Design a protein around this nucleic acid. Structure first.
Ligand SMILES: NC[C@@H]1O[C@H](O[C@H]2[C@@H](O)[C@H](O[C@@H]3[C@@H](O)[C@H](N)C[C@H](N)[C@H]3O[C@H]3O[C@H](CO)[C@@H](O)[C@H](O)[C@H]3N)O[C@@H]2CO)[C@H](N)[C@@H](O)[C@@H]1O
Ligand SMILES: [Mg+2]
Ligand SMILES: [Mg+2]
Lengths: 72, 65, 90
RNA sequence: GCUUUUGGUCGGUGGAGUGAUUUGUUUGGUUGAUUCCGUCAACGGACGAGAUCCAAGCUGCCCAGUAGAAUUCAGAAUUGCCCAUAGGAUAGGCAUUCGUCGAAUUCUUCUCUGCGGGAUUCCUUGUAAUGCACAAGGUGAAAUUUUGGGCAACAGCAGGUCUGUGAUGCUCCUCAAUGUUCUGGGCGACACGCGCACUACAAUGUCAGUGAGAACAAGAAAAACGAGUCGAACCUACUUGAUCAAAAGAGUGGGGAAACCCCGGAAUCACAUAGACUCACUUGGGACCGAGGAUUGCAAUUAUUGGUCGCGCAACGAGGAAUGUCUCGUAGGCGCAGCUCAUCAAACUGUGCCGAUUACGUCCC
RNA sequence: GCGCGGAUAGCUCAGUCGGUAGAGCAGGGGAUUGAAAAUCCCCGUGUCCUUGGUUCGAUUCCGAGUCCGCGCACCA
C-alpha cells in the first residue's frame, strides 16, 4: 500500500520541527517513512530546517542531500 | 578459526579445475600443541603460495591426488 | 575503517563444492575479498530497487551491519548460510 | 561456405612386405604450430605453419598561406571595499582575457607522412638438466605469435549459386509467346508457431534546464539541355521567415573535399540545478488511433517520412523449461558516419566515447 | 452396558503429570547441477475431538458424555 500524505497536517509538522532535529543522519527518505510524508515534502521540510539552523547540511548534491543534527 | 599459511600449491584438482589442492602450515603460537603442523587441504578460489587463510576444522586432511 | 571491517567480515571462510561427493573446501583470501565486495554491492542494489531509500543509504546500511557482524546485512545472511552448509557437507 | 581455428598433407630414391600398404611423417621433452632439440632404415626435398602484408601503440629524417604554435609592440575587456536567500569541499622582475575579423618575426612542441629505427626471450635469478626451452622480475612506449586482422596447403561435401554476368551444356516457351513493355494489384495479406533485433518494466530514475566535449567519414552529370571553355543537379554554413508554434519555405555565401561545413558544440556522462516528481502501473512505458498540417514523388489508398495536439484504462513490476556471446580499452552501455537511399534504418559495415565483474584454470559437459 | 487404548495441521505422531505446542511429512523459494533421482537450506502451518470444576494459566489435572479399537458382559 504505502499511502503517504502529500501535504502537512498540523500534527505532523510539529513532528518535523521537534523530533527531526534530534535525529542523527537525517535524509529525506528517513523522514518519509518515519513521518509518513512524501519525499517531495520531506526534502522541502528539511530545507526549511537548515535556514533556521536547526539541522546541519553535512553532504549535498543535486539529488542526494544528507543532513545531521547540530550539536552546539 | 585458525589461520594457516600456504607453503605449497599442489596443483589444480577437481573435475572442473576450480578447486586447488594446497599444503597449508598451521601457524600456531609456538608454545601450542599443534605448532608447525602442516595439512594438505583443498582451497576454492585463486590461491598462490604464502597466502594465509582461515580454517574451521583443522583436524581433517584432504585425500591427495 | 568501517569498510575494511565490512570487507573482512563479508564473505564466508569456508564453502562446499564437488571435488570427489560435495566436499567442504577452504576459501582463498583473494576470493574472500572478491565475494565480500560482490555480496555487499549485491543486496544493497536489491534493497533500493523499488524502495523509497536511496542507493547511498542502502549501500551505507549493508556496509555498517556487515562491519558490526550483524545479521541484518544481506551478505551476513549468505555468509552464515554458506558456512553452515559447508559445515554439514564436510 | 563448410569439413577446419585445426597443424596438417605430398613425391623422389633407399629399406619392409606376395600384396593393399608401410618407413620417412617417431616413441622423449618442447611450442599456438610434424614449432624445434634429440633419437632414428632412412636420406634429401616441396607445400602448409613461421615469414611476407595491413592497422594501432613509442620514435628519426623530411614538412606545411590545405597543420599548428609561441613571443614583442599597438587596440579592447575585468580591476577589488564587496563573503548568495542557508553557502560547504577543493592549486596559486611582470595581475589576467581575446572577430581585436591587429600588424609584425622567430619557431616545429602537438598535426599530416614516404621510407626508416625500436622487441630479440634481450638482460636477471628458480624450472628443466646436453639441448630445445619455461616461470618470475628487469629493461621499456611495447614483453612473448607485442596487439588486432588479412592471406592460408592437401583432400573432399553429389553444401549454395543455372535469381550476378554477353558464365555455360541439355531441355522447355517462342507472336493472343515462359520474350518485352505498359496499366492495375501482389510480394506487406493474419486464429497461429518460431529465429533475430528494438523499447521498456523506473528513483544508480523520468522530466525541465545548464555545462564540458569524439573519431571514422561522405559531398555536384553525361557525344544530354543551356550559355572548345563555363553553368546548374550534391553536401552545406549564414541570414531570413519573425510586431510571434514546430515542421517548413526562401535569400546569400562556401566547398571537388586536410583547404567549406569545422575550434566537426555526438550521446552516455556532468552539475552546491539550493529545479519539479516520491514508489505508484505513477510525471515509468509509449504500443494503439483520432484530427489538423507540411515536405519526397509522375503516383502516398493497404497511414512513405517528419512535425503538432489528443489517446495512453495496451501489455509490461525483472521473466518457466531452456539458451547465446565474452578474458582488457574487453563485456556492457552510448551515440555517429557510411552503405541500401527521390522519400524511408529497430539492419549491416566502420568509428569513437564511458568503462567494469571474473578467471589466467580444467577435461566435468 | 465392563475395563483397557486411540482422538494433537491435509496426512503422521511423542508429550511438562495442574507455567502455552513440538518434531515427522506434504505444500511455495534458492542451492546441487548440463540434466536426473535422492540430499540440503529457506517461507506454510493445529482455538490441540466436546463440556464443565474453570489450579497463578486446561493439548497437560479432574467429572461426564459423543467416536474408535481390542479382551470380556448377557433373566421385561
Ligand atoms: N592462423 C592462426 C591460427 O591460430 C590457431 O590457434 C588459435 C587458437 O588456439 C586460439 O584461438 C582461439 C579460438 O580457438 C577460440 N575459438 C576463440 C579464442 N578467442 C581464440 O583465441 C585467440 O584469438 C583472440 C583474438 O580475438 C585472442 O583473444 C586470443 O589471444 C587468441 N588466443 O589461439 C590461436 C590464435 O592466436 C591455430 N594454432 C592455427 O589454426 C593457426 O595458427
Ligand atoms: Mg619404394
Ligand atoms: Mg511461462
Amino acid at each position: 500500500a504505502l499511502q503517504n500524505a502529500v501535504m502537512f497536517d498540523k500534527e505532523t509538522y510539529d513532528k518535523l520541527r521537534s523530533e527531526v532535529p534530534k535525529y542523527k543522519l537525517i535524509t529525506p527518505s528517513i523522514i518519509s517513512d518515519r513521518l509518513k510524508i512524501a519525499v517531495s515534502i520531506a526534502a522541502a521540510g528539511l530545507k526549511q530546517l537548515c535556514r533556521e539552523k536547526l539541522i546541519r547540511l553535512v553532504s549535498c548534491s543535486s539529488k542526494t542531500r544528507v543532513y545531521t543534527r547540530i550539536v552546539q | 578459526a585458525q589461520v594457516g599459511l600456504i607453503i605449497k600449491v599442489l596443483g589444480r584438482t577437481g573435475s572442473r579445475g576450480n578447486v586447488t589442492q594446497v599444503r597449508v602450515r598451521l601457524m600456531a603460537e609456538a608454545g601450542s600443541p599443534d605448532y608447525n603442523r602442516t595439512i594438505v587441504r583443498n582451497v576454492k578460489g585463486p590461491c598462490k603460495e604464502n597466502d594465509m587463510l582461515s580454517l574451521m576444522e583443522t583436524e581433517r586432511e584432504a585425500r591427495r591426488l | 575503517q568501517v569498510v575494511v571491517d565490512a570487507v573482512s567480515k563479508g564473505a564466508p571462510r569456508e564453502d562446499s563444492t564437488r571435488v570427489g561427493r560435495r566436499q567442504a573446501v577452504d576459501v582463498s583470501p583473494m576470493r574472500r575479498v572478491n565475494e565480500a565486495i560482490y555480496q555487499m554491492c549485491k543486496g544493497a542494489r536489491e534493497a533500493a530497487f523499488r524502495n523509497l531509500k536511496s542507493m547511498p543509504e542502502c549501500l551505507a546500511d549493508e556496509i555498517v551491519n556487515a562491519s558490526k557482524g550483524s545479521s541484518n546485512s544481506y551478505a551476513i545472511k549468505k555468509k552464515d548460510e554458506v558456512e553452515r552448509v559447508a559445515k554439514a557437507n564436510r
